[PDB]
Amino acid sequence: PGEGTQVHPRAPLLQILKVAGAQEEVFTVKEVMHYLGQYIMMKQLYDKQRQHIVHCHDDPLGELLEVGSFSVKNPSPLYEMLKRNLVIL
């Protein structure tokens, strides 16, 4: 979904975006990615030394991604999670 597509995220993903500050029920994919970055940043999930690595184990984000960690340069787990967690409007 790329063409400024409008989406409603499933409950578990929506809870995460609202923690990141989203006061919203409808998003574009771009807006979802914005709030995902916000979340990782504010919960400081990225590795301190190697900041492309995100440690999401023992966080609700890990529950959705289904991995303990991921690289932002290997973002497949993220896009897969979004395929499962976004309803197209």
């Binding site: 970055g37 990782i40 940043m41 900041q51 995100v54 932002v72 340069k73 973002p75």
Partner: peptide, 11 residues
Amino acid sequence: ETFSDLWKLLP
């Protein structure tokens, strides 16, 4: 280098 720099460069 910074997570925020890296995140911005997501395809």
